[PDB]
Design goal:
The structure is cut from a larger assembly and holds chains A and B.
Chain A (H helix, E strand, L loop, with lengths): L17 H18 L6 H8 L1
Helix pairs in contact in A: 1-2
Chain B lengths: L1 H12 L2 H10 L10 H8 L5 H14 L5 H4 L4
Classes of the chains: A mainly alpha, B mainly alpha.
Chain lengths: 50, 75
């Protein structure tokens, strides 16, 4: 994606859009959703993410 | 994978020889499935009783709270 400045950041971090965050970390999200039991199975986890 | 794990543990929840019946009638955790007469030979009781066992097991699992977790796999 396109970059923008955002001066207030600390030197060791970077601003990342949510929607990309979901797209990338989809499987991590599924794992955590199933671990804590908020979702019965992976399919319900997918629906809950969408 | 999740489905095989869940079905294995839920079969473990049911009785021994009925569980083996249901595994043998299908290919669950096993190779080619044998038709009812051959499984009945496997227990040496070879007749409609084997399908009686099948229907009784199915009936016994119909009761909710055990299969709903597997109900989730439908969509």
């Amino acid at each position: 994606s396109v970059i923008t400045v955002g001066p207030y950041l600390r030197l060791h971090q970077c601003g990342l859009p949510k929607k990309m965050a979901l797209e990338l970390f989809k499987p991590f999200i599924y794992g955590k959703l199933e671990l804590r039991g908020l979702a019965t199975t992976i399919k319900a986890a997918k629906k809950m993410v969408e | 994978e999740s489905l095989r794990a869940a079905t294995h543990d839920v079969l473990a929840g049911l009785t021994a020889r009925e569980a083996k019946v249901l595994r043998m009638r299908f290919g669950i955790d096993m190779n080619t499935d044998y038709t009812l007469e051959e499984v009945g030979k496997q227990f040496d009781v070879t007749r409609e009783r084997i399908r009686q066992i099948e229907a009784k097991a199915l009936r016994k699992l119909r009761h909710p709270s055990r299969s709903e977790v597997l109900r989730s796999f439908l969509d």
